[PDB]
Amino acid sequence: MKNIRNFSIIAHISTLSDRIIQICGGQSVTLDYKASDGETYQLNFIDTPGHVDFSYEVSRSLAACEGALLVVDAGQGVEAQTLANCYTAMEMDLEVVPVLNKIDLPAADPERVAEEIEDIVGIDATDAVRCSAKTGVGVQDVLERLVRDIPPPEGDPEGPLQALIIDSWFDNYLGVVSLIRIKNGTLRKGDKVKVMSTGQTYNADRLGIFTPKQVDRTELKCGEVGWLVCAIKDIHGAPVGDTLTLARNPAEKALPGFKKVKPQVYAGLFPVSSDDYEAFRDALGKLSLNDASLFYEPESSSALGFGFRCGFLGLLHMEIIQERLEREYDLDLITTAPTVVYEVETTSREVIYVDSPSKLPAVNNIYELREPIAECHMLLPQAYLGNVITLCVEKRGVQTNMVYHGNQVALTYEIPMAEVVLDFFDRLKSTSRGYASLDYNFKRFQASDMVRVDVLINGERVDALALITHRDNSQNRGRELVEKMKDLIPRQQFDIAIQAAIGTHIIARSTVKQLRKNVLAKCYG
């Protein structure tokens, strides 16, 4: 155990990971490093996604580490995407090792970037190892620093097994494969294992390490990271963050910090052409085999046809899947505005949760409707803050903190999730012209004057299209909706009456005029 270093990399823009592999061996790697002390160290490097959509997946990977390398471009500086992960890595007791990369570039300013790390992250950066990507010098010095500072792993190898599931995927030949950290005990080949969430037991048919090449082993001992193949049916059967133990001597308690994350953002997806339904259903199925957190459930509108109601972790989780659906499976989809999860107290005081507005209990039965609030961390040059908070309050945000970092401002606001999810990020980007970095996570539910806009077209109730929004801009969101539809619905054979209402009271009503005879229905570019 004492010669093992488990660490992850927090960076942005040959990446350091590739150069480390090159001076050792030659998503995760197990490497050997003969150090200046003449001894050999097993380096286990777990990769880290940079976005707060995968906030949980990130934290589970970090729970598998004792340290992390904060890799900053010496020619650029720090950026908020590495900040979120950096703080969580520090909240958990991980040794964060600062690295100044790309010192070779004509732009490199190491001393000033050493101040930026010290000022914004609060890590001792004065003796940070620095390294070239052109030549590769310093990478060994980084590795030496890694070995000296990151604590070795801990546990009892004879203790009852506790293996942290870092990640689980589907292999088209091997079945389900899990990347595993042995926190406690020892896992051998024959061993019959138990997944602690599910309570189900399987045989460890195969296990090994990534070299990067997939290499079989006969056991994974304490402090180690590797892969495991037992015939778990789907990746849901080995949830990320779960803990593996042995069936004959099961651990009393699972490793802390496990949860099965439920989608934060729901949306409705419908194929432009009904003929694509078969492919779309297949595409979601194919996606779901590797996406542990993608939720999808059939939904059919009168208006929009047969499609699917889908749950996502956040905006670019949705956008990754949308981009994938669009390009991999060549599907053209209509997508409804994203709607978030509300917390509602019934007249008979019970707490229920609402994904889709249509399901929200009657206005008479609601004692208190509670709205999700997102805490938004932002980095922006001083010349834009006026343009930024004016948007923040415009979206009903409340300022929680502000810190100055040279000629740069660190804003932290409390903006209603419902509103962050409806393209706020874009309006922020165009008012700061790409200079404001968003970073948000769920904070709290709060009581709020929240109403439900119902769409009906051809007098038919389109539940898929319903939205929950605040009173003060229900008139505007209803009006924008009727306009959005006028784009999706061209002038056709019949008149199409579109309207938004609150219960009985109509807020906007527009009709899409029918074509004359012998005129084809056209659409805008």
Coordinates of C-alpha atoms in Angstrom, one line a residue:
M1 CA 0.0 0.0 0.0
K2 CA 2.8 2.4 1.0
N3 CA 4.1 2.5 -2.6
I4 CA 0.7 3.4 -4.1
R5 CA -0.4 6.9 -5.2
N6 CA -4.1 7.3 -6.3
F7 CA -4.7 10.7 -7.9
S8 CA -6.8 12.5 -10.4
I9 CA -6.1 15.4 -12.8
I10 CA -8.0 18.7 -12.8
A11 CA -7.2 20.7 -15.9
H12 CA -8.8 22.3 -19.0
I13 CA -7.1 22.6 -22.4
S14 CA -0.4 16.4 -25.4
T15 CA -2.2 16.5 -22.0
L16 CA -0.2 15.8 -18.9
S17 CA -1.9 12.4 -18.6
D18 CA -0.3 11.4 -21.9
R19 CA 3.1 12.5 -20.9
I20 CA 2.9 10.7 -17.6
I21 CA 2.0 7.5 -19.4
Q22 CA 5.0 8.0 -21.8
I23 CA 7.6 8.2 -19.0
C24 CA 6.1 5.2 -17.2
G25 CA 4.4 2.2 -19.0
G26 CA 5.0 3.8 -22.4
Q27 CA -10.0 7.1 -18.7
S28 CA -7.8 5.5 -16.0
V29 CA -4.2 4.2 -15.9
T30 CA -2.1 2.1 -13.7
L31 CA 1.6 2.9 -14.1
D32 CA 5.0 2.0 -12.6
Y33 CA 7.5 4.7 -11.5
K34 CA 11.0 4.0 -10.4
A35 CA 11.7 7.1 -8.3
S36 CA 14.9 8.9 -7.3
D37 CA 14.6 7.0 -4.0
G38 CA 15.4 3.9 -6.0
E39 CA 11.9 2.4 -5.2
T40 CA 9.0 1.6 -7.4
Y41 CA 5.6 3.2 -7.1
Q42 CA 2.3 2.1 -8.5
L43 CA 0.6 5.2 -9.9
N44 CA -3.2 5.0 -10.3
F45 CA -4.6 7.9 -12.3
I46 CA -8.4 8.3 -12.4
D47 CA -9.8 10.8 -15.0
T48 CA -12.1 13.6 -14.0
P49 CA -14.9 15.2 -16.1
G50 CA -14.9 19.0 -15.7
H51 CA -18.6 19.8 -15.5
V52 CA -21.0 20.2 -12.6
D53 CA -23.6 18.2 -14.5
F54 CA -21.6 15.1 -13.5
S55 CA -21.0 16.6 -10.0
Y56 CA -21.7 13.2 -8.4
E57 CA -19.7 11.0 -10.8
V58 CA -16.9 13.5 -10.1
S59 CA -17.0 13.2 -6.3
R60 CA -17.0 9.4 -6.5
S61 CA -13.9 9.4 -8.6
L62 CA -12.3 11.8 -6.1
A63 CA -13.3 9.6 -3.1
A64 CA -11.1 6.9 -4.8
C65 CA -8.1 9.3 -4.6
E66 CA -5.7 10.6 -1.9
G67 CA -4.5 13.5 -4.1
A68 CA -5.1 15.4 -7.3
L69 CA -2.9 17.4 -9.7
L70 CA -4.2 20.9 -10.4
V71 CA -2.7 21.5 -13.8
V72 CA -2.8 25.1 -14.9
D73 CA -1.5 26.6 -18.1
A74 CA 1.3 29.0 -17.3
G75 CA 0.4 31.0 -20.3
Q76 CA -3.3 31.3 -19.4
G77 CA -4.3 31.1 -15.7
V78 CA -7.1 29.3 -13.8
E79 CA -10.7 28.9 -14.9
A80 CA -14.0 28.2 -13.0
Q81 CA -14.5 24.7 -14.5
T82 CA -11.4 23.6 -12.6
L83 CA -12.6 25.6 -9.5
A84 CA -15.7 23.6 -8.7
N85 CA -13.8 20.4 -8.8
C86 CA -10.9 21.9 -6.9
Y87 CA -13.0 23.0 -4.0
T88 CA -14.7 19.6 -3.7
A89 CA -11.3 17.9 -3.8
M90 CA -10.2 20.2 -0.9
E91 CA -13.5 19.6 1.1
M92 CA -12.6 15.9 0.9
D93 CA -9.1 15.7 2.4
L94 CA -7.1 15.3 -0.8
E95 CA -3.6 16.6 -1.4
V96 CA -3.9 19.0 -4.3
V97 CA -0.6 19.3 -6.2
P98 CA -0.3 22.5 -8.3
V99 CA 1.5 22.1 -11.7
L100 CA 2.4 24.9 -14.1
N101 CA 2.3 23.5 -17.6
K102 CA 3.5 24.9 -20.9
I103 CA 6.3 27.0 -19.6
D104 CA 7.9 26.8 -23.0
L105 CA 5.3 29.0 -24.7
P106 CA 6.1 32.6 -25.5
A107 CA 3.0 33.6 -23.4
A108 CA 4.1 31.8 -20.2
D109 CA 3.9 33.9 -17.0
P110 CA 4.6 31.5 -14.2
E111 CA 5.0 33.9 -11.2
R112 CA 1.7 35.7 -12.0
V113 CA -0.1 32.4 -12.4
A114 CA 1.4 31.3 -9.1
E115 CA -0.4 34.3 -7.6
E116 CA -3.7 33.3 -9.3
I117 CA -3.7 29.8 -7.8
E118 CA -2.8 31.2 -4.4
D119 CA -5.4 34.0 -4.5
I120 CA -8.4 32.1 -6.0
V121 CA -7.9 28.5 -4.9
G122 CA -5.8 29.1 -1.8
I123 CA -3.1 26.4 -2.5
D124 CA 0.6 26.9 -1.7
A125 CA 1.9 27.3 -5.2
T126 CA 5.3 28.9 -4.6
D127 CA 7.3 25.7 -5.1
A128 CA 5.0 24.3 -7.8
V129 CA 6.8 22.1 -10.3
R130 CA 6.7 23.4 -13.9
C131 CA 6.9 21.5 -17.2
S132 CA 7.0 21.6 -21.0
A133 CA 4.7 19.8 -23.4
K134 CA 7.1 20.3 -26.3
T135 CA 10.1 18.6 -24.6
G136 CA 8.5 16.9 -21.6
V137 CA 11.0 18.0 -19.0
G138 CA 9.5 18.6 -15.6
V139 CA 6.9 15.8 -16.0
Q140 CA 9.3 13.5 -14.0
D141 CA 9.7 16.3 -11.4
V142 CA 5.9 16.4 -11.2
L143 CA 5.8 12.7 -10.7
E144 CA 8.5 13.0 -8.0
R145 CA 6.5 15.7 -6.3
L146 CA 3.4 13.5 -6.6
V147 CA 5.1 10.6 -4.8
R148 CA 6.4 12.8 -2.0
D149 CA 3.2 14.7 -1.1
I150 CA 0.2 12.6 -1.9
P151 CA -0.4 10.2 1.1
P152 CA -0.4 6.4 0.4
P153 CA -3.9 4.7 0.6
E154 CA -5.2 3.2 3.8
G155 CA -7.1 0.1 4.9
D156 CA -6.8 -3.4 6.3
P157 CA -6.1 -5.9 3.5
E158 CA -7.4 -8.8 5.7
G159 CA -10.4 -6.6 6.7
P160 CA -13.9 -7.2 5.2
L161 CA -13.9 -6.2 1.5
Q162 CA -15.0 -2.6 0.5
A163 CA -14.4 -1.7 -3.1
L164 CA -15.7 1.7 -4.4
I165 CA -17.4 1.6 -7.8
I166 CA -15.8 4.5 -9.6
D167 CA -17.5 3.9 -13.0
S168 CA -19.5 1.2 -14.8
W169 CA -19.8 0.7 -18.6
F170 CA -21.1 -1.8 -21.1
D171 CA -18.5 -3.8 -23.1
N172 CA -19.9 -5.4 -26.3
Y173 CA -18.1 -8.6 -25.5
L174 CA -17.3 -8.7 -21.8
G175 CA -20.7 -7.4 -20.7
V176 CA -20.8 -5.0 -17.8
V177 CA -17.3 -3.8 -16.6
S178 CA -16.7 -1.7 -13.4
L179 CA -13.7 0.4 -12.5
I180 CA -13.0 -0.3 -8.9
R181 CA -11.0 1.1 -5.9
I182 CA -10.1 -1.3 -3.2
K183 CA -10.6 0.8 0.0
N184 CA -10.5 -2.2 2.3
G185 CA -9.7 -5.9 2.2
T186 CA -8.7 -8.0 -0.9
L187 CA -10.6 -9.1 -4.0
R188 CA -9.6 -12.4 -5.7
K189 CA -10.8 -14.1 -8.9
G190 CA -13.0 -16.9 -7.5
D191 CA -14.5 -14.6 -4.9
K192 CA -18.3 -14.3 -4.9
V193 CA -19.1 -10.6 -4.4
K194 CA -22.1 -8.5 -3.2
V195 CA -23.2 -5.1 -4.5
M196 CA -24.4 -3.3 -1.4
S197 CA -27.1 -1.1 -3.0
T198 CA -28.8 -4.0 -4.8
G199 CA -28.0 -6.8 -2.4
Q200 CA -27.2 -9.1 -5.3
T201 CA -24.3 -11.5 -5.5
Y202 CA -22.0 -12.4 -8.5
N203 CA -18.8 -14.2 -9.2
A204 CA -15.6 -12.3 -9.9
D205 CA -15.0 -14.1 -13.2
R206 CA -12.3 -11.6 -14.4
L207 CA -10.4 -8.7 -12.9
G208 CA -7.3 -6.7 -13.9
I209 CA -5.7 -3.3 -14.4
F210 CA -5.5 -0.7 -17.2
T211 CA -2.0 -0.3 -18.5
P212 CA -3.6 1.5 -20.6
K213 CA -4.0 -1.9 -22.3
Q214 CA -6.5 -4.2 -20.6
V215 CA -4.4 -6.6 -18.6
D216 CA -5.8 -9.5 -16.5
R217 CA -4.8 -10.0 -12.9
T218 CA -5.4 -12.7 -10.3
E219 CA -6.5 -10.3 -7.6
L220 CA -6.8 -6.6 -6.8
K221 CA -5.3 -5.9 -3.4
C222 CA -5.8 -3.1 -0.9
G223 CA -5.3 0.4 -2.2
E224 CA -5.5 -0.7 -5.8
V225 CA -7.6 0.4 -8.8
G226 CA -8.7 -1.9 -11.6
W227 CA -11.5 -3.4 -13.6
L228 CA -14.0 -6.2 -12.7
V229 CA -16.1 -8.5 -14.8
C230 CA -18.9 -10.5 -13.2
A231 CA -22.1 -10.9 -15.2
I232 CA -24.1 -8.0 -13.9
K233 CA -27.0 -7.5 -16.2
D234 CA -26.8 -3.7 -16.7
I235 CA -24.8 -0.8 -15.4
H236 CA -27.6 0.1 -13.1
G237 CA -26.7 -3.2 -11.3
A238 CA -23.3 -1.6 -10.4
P239 CA -24.2 2.0 -9.5
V240 CA -21.4 4.6 -9.5
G241 CA -20.5 5.3 -5.8
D242 CA -21.7 1.9 -4.6
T243 CA -19.5 -0.4 -2.7
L244 CA -18.5 -4.0 -3.4
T245 CA -18.0 -6.5 -0.6
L246 CA -17.6 -10.3 -0.2
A247 CA -20.6 -12.6 0.3
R248 CA -19.0 -14.9 3.0
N249 CA -17.8 -12.0 5.1
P250 CA -19.8 -8.9 4.2
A251 CA -18.8 -5.4 5.4
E252 CA -21.0 -4.0 8.1
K253 CA -21.4 -0.6 6.4
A254 CA -21.1 0.6 2.9
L255 CA -18.6 3.4 2.0
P256 CA -20.1 6.8 2.7
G257 CA -21.4 9.3 0.1
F258 CA -23.5 7.0 -2.0
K259 CA -26.7 8.1 -3.7
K260 CA -28.5 7.2 -6.9
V261 CA -28.9 10.6 -8.5
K262 CA -32.3 11.4 -10.0
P263 CA -32.4 13.7 -13.1
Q264 CA -32.5 17.5 -12.4
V265 CA -33.8 18.6 -15.7
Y266 CA -36.7 16.9 -17.7
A267 CA -37.7 17.6 -21.3
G268 CA -40.0 16.2 -24.0
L269 CA -38.4 14.9 -27.2
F270 CA -40.5 14.2 -30.3
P271 CA -39.4 13.1 -33.8
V272 CA -40.2 15.6 -36.6
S273 CA -41.2 12.6 -38.7
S274 CA -43.3 9.8 -37.2
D275 CA -41.4 7.2 -39.3
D276 CA -38.3 7.9 -37.1
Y277 CA -40.0 6.6 -33.9
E278 CA -38.5 3.1 -34.2
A279 CA -35.0 4.4 -34.6
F280 CA -35.5 7.0 -31.8
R281 CA -36.7 4.3 -29.3
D282 CA -33.7 2.1 -30.4
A283 CA -31.3 5.1 -30.0
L284 CA -32.4 5.8 -26.4
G285 CA -32.1 2.1 -25.7
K286 CA -28.6 2.0 -27.1
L287 CA -27.7 5.2 -25.2
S288 CA -29.2 3.8 -21.9
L289 CA -26.8 0.9 -22.0
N290 CA -23.9 3.2 -21.2
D291 CA -25.7 6.1 -19.6
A292 CA -26.4 5.3 -16.0
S293 CA -28.4 8.5 -15.4
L294 CA -30.3 9.0 -18.7
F295 CA -34.0 8.7 -18.0
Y296 CA -36.6 8.2 -20.8
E297 CA -40.3 7.3 -20.8
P298 CA -42.9 7.1 -23.6
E299 CA -45.1 10.2 -24.1
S300 CA -47.7 11.0 -26.8
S301 CA -49.1 14.3 -27.7
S302 CA -52.1 14.8 -29.9
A303 CA -50.2 17.6 -31.6
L304 CA -46.5 16.5 -31.6
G305 CA -47.1 12.7 -32.1
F306 CA -45.4 9.9 -30.4
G307 CA -42.1 10.6 -28.6
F308 CA -40.3 10.4 -25.3
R309 CA -40.1 12.3 -22.0
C310 CA -36.5 12.4 -20.9
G311 CA -34.6 13.2 -17.7
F312 CA -31.1 14.7 -17.5
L313 CA -28.6 15.7 -14.9
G314 CA -28.3 19.2 -16.4
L315 CA -28.1 21.3 -19.5
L316 CA -25.1 19.8 -21.4
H317 CA -26.0 16.3 -20.3
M318 CA -29.1 17.0 -22.2
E319 CA -27.1 18.7 -25.0
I320 CA -24.6 15.8 -25.2
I321 CA -27.5 13.4 -25.7
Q322 CA -29.2 15.7 -28.1
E323 CA -26.1 16.2 -30.2
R324 CA -25.6 12.4 -30.1
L325 CA -29.2 11.7 -31.1
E326 CA -28.8 14.2 -33.9
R327 CA -25.4 13.1 -35.4
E328 CA -24.8 9.4 -34.4
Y329 CA -28.3 8.2 -35.1
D330 CA -29.2 11.0 -37.6
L331 CA -32.4 12.0 -35.9
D332 CA -34.3 15.3 -36.3
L333 CA -36.1 16.0 -33.1
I334 CA -38.6 18.6 -31.7
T335 CA -37.6 19.3 -28.1
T336 CA -39.9 20.9 -25.4
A337 CA -38.6 23.6 -23.0
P338 CA -36.8 21.9 -20.0
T339 CA -38.8 21.7 -16.8
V340 CA -37.3 21.2 -13.4
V341 CA -38.3 19.3 -10.2
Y342 CA -40.6 21.1 -7.8
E343 CA -41.4 20.3 -4.2
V344 CA -45.1 20.6 -3.4
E345 CA -47.0 20.6 -0.1
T346 CA -50.5 19.4 -0.5
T347 CA -53.6 20.9 1.3
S348 CA -53.3 17.7 3.4
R349 CA -49.6 18.5 4.2
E350 CA -47.5 15.9 2.4
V351 CA -44.4 16.5 0.3
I352 CA -44.6 15.3 -3.3
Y353 CA -42.3 16.0 -6.3
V354 CA -43.3 17.1 -9.7
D355 CA -41.4 16.6 -13.0
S356 CA -44.1 17.5 -15.5
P357 CA -46.5 20.5 -14.9
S358 CA -49.5 18.4 -16.1
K359 CA -49.2 16.3 -13.0
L360 CA -49.0 19.2 -10.5
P361 CA -51.9 19.1 -8.1
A362 CA -54.8 21.6 -8.4
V363 CA -54.2 25.2 -7.2
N364 CA -56.7 24.6 -4.4
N365 CA -54.8 21.6 -3.1
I366 CA -51.5 23.4 -2.9
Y367 CA -50.5 24.7 0.5
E368 CA -47.0 25.7 -0.5
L369 CA -45.2 25.3 -3.9
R370 CA -41.5 25.1 -3.4
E371 CA -39.0 26.1 -6.2
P372 CA -35.5 24.7 -6.6
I373 CA -32.8 27.3 -6.2
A374 CA -29.4 27.0 -7.8
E375 CA -26.2 28.5 -6.4
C376 CA -24.3 30.0 -9.3
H377 CA -20.5 30.7 -9.1
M378 CA -19.2 33.0 -11.8
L379 CA -15.9 34.4 -13.0
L380 CA -16.0 37.6 -15.0
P381 CA -13.7 40.6 -15.8
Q382 CA -14.8 43.7 -13.8
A383 CA -16.0 45.6 -17.0
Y384 CA -19.1 43.3 -17.2
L385 CA -20.5 42.9 -13.7
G386 CA -23.1 45.7 -14.3
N387 CA -24.3 43.7 -17.3
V388 CA -24.2 40.5 -15.4
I389 CA -26.1 41.1 -12.1
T390 CA -28.6 43.1 -14.1
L391 CA -29.3 39.8 -15.8
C392 CA -29.1 37.9 -12.5
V393 CA -31.7 40.0 -10.7
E394 CA -33.6 40.1 -14.0
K395 CA -34.0 36.3 -13.7
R396 CA -35.0 36.8 -10.0
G397 CA -31.6 36.1 -8.5
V398 CA -30.2 37.2 -5.1
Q399 CA -26.5 38.0 -4.6
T400 CA -24.9 35.8 -2.0
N401 CA -21.2 36.8 -2.2
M402 CA -18.6 38.8 -4.3
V403 CA -14.8 38.5 -4.2
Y404 CA -12.2 40.5 -6.2
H405 CA -9.3 38.7 -7.8
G406 CA -7.1 41.3 -9.5
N407 CA -9.1 42.8 -12.4
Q408 CA -11.5 39.8 -12.1
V409 CA -14.7 39.3 -10.1
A410 CA -16.0 36.1 -8.4
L411 CA -19.8 36.4 -8.3
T412 CA -21.9 33.9 -6.5
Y413 CA -25.7 34.2 -6.8
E414 CA -28.8 32.3 -5.8
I415 CA -30.9 32.0 -9.0
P416 CA -34.1 29.9 -9.3
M417 CA -33.1 26.6 -11.1
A418 CA -36.3 26.8 -13.2
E419 CA -34.7 29.9 -14.7
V420 CA -31.1 28.8 -15.0
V421 CA -32.2 25.9 -17.1
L422 CA -34.2 28.1 -19.5
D423 CA -31.3 29.5 -21.6
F424 CA -29.9 32.0 -19.1
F425 CA -26.3 30.7 -19.7
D426 CA -26.6 32.0 -23.3
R427 CA -27.8 35.5 -22.3
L428 CA -25.0 35.7 -19.8
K429 CA -22.5 34.6 -22.5
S430 CA -23.6 37.3 -24.9
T431 CA -23.7 40.1 -22.4
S432 CA -20.2 39.2 -21.1
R433 CA -19.3 38.2 -24.7
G434 CA -18.0 34.8 -23.6
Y435 CA -16.1 36.1 -20.5
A436 CA -18.4 34.9 -17.7
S437 CA -18.1 31.3 -16.6
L438 CA -21.2 29.6 -15.2
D439 CA -21.0 27.0 -12.4
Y440 CA -24.2 25.9 -10.6
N441 CA -25.5 23.2 -8.2
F442 CA -28.8 22.6 -6.4
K443 CA -28.9 24.5 -3.1
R444 CA -32.4 24.5 -1.6
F445 CA -36.1 24.5 -2.2
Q446 CA -38.0 27.8 -1.4
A447 CA -41.6 28.9 -1.3
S448 CA -42.5 30.8 -4.4
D449 CA -45.5 32.2 -6.3
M450 CA -45.3 29.7 -9.1
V451 CA -48.0 29.0 -11.7
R452 CA -48.7 26.6 -14.5
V453 CA -49.2 27.6 -18.2
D454 CA -51.2 25.1 -20.2
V455 CA -50.9 24.9 -24.0
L456 CA -53.8 23.8 -26.2
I457 CA -53.8 23.5 -30.0
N458 CA -56.8 22.5 -32.0
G459 CA -58.6 22.6 -28.6
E460 CA -56.5 19.6 -27.7
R461 CA -54.7 19.6 -24.4
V462 CA -50.9 19.4 -25.1
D463 CA -49.6 18.2 -21.7
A464 CA -46.1 17.7 -23.1
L465 CA -45.9 21.4 -23.7
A466 CA -47.1 22.7 -20.3
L467 CA -44.6 24.8 -18.2
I468 CA -44.2 26.0 -14.6
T469 CA -43.1 29.6 -14.2
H470 CA -43.3 32.5 -11.8
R471 CA -46.4 34.8 -11.9
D472 CA -44.6 38.0 -12.8
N473 CA -43.5 36.6 -16.2
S474 CA -46.2 34.1 -16.9
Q475 CA -47.7 36.6 -19.3
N476 CA -44.5 36.7 -21.2
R477 CA -43.5 33.0 -21.1
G478 CA -47.0 32.1 -22.3
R479 CA -46.6 34.6 -25.2
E480 CA -43.1 33.3 -26.1
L481 CA -44.5 29.8 -26.2
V482 CA -47.3 30.6 -28.7
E483 CA -44.6 32.2 -30.8
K484 CA -42.2 29.3 -30.5
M485 CA -45.0 27.0 -31.8
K486 CA -45.7 29.3 -34.8
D487 CA -42.1 28.3 -35.9
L488 CA -42.7 24.6 -35.4
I489 CA -46.1 24.7 -37.1
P490 CA -46.1 25.9 -40.7
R491 CA -49.2 27.2 -42.5
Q492 CA -51.0 24.0 -43.5
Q493 CA -54.1 22.4 -44.8
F494 CA -56.3 23.3 -41.8
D495 CA -56.4 26.3 -39.4
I496 CA -54.4 25.6 -36.3
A497 CA -55.5 27.5 -33.2
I498 CA -52.7 27.8 -30.6
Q499 CA -53.3 29.2 -27.1
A500 CA -51.7 29.4 -23.7
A501 CA -53.8 29.8 -20.5
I502 CA -53.7 29.7 -16.7
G503 CA -56.5 27.3 -15.9
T504 CA -59.4 29.1 -17.6
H505 CA -57.9 32.5 -18.2
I506 CA -56.2 32.9 -21.6
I507 CA -52.9 34.8 -21.8
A508 CA -52.1 34.4 -25.5
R509 CA -54.0 33.0 -28.5
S510 CA -52.7 32.9 -32.1
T511 CA -54.0 31.0 -35.1
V512 CA -51.8 29.6 -37.9
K513 CA -53.7 30.4 -41.1
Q514 CA -54.5 27.6 -43.5
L515 CA -52.9 27.5 -47.0
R516 CA -54.8 28.2 -50.1
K517 CA -55.4 25.2 -52.4
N518 CA -52.5 24.1 -54.6
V519 CA -50.0 25.7 -52.3
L520 CA -47.3 23.6 -50.5
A521 CA -46.5 23.9 -46.8
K522 CA -43.0 25.5 -46.5
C523 CA -40.5 26.1 -43.7
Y524 CA -37.9 28.7 -42.8
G525 CA -34.1 28.2 -42.9

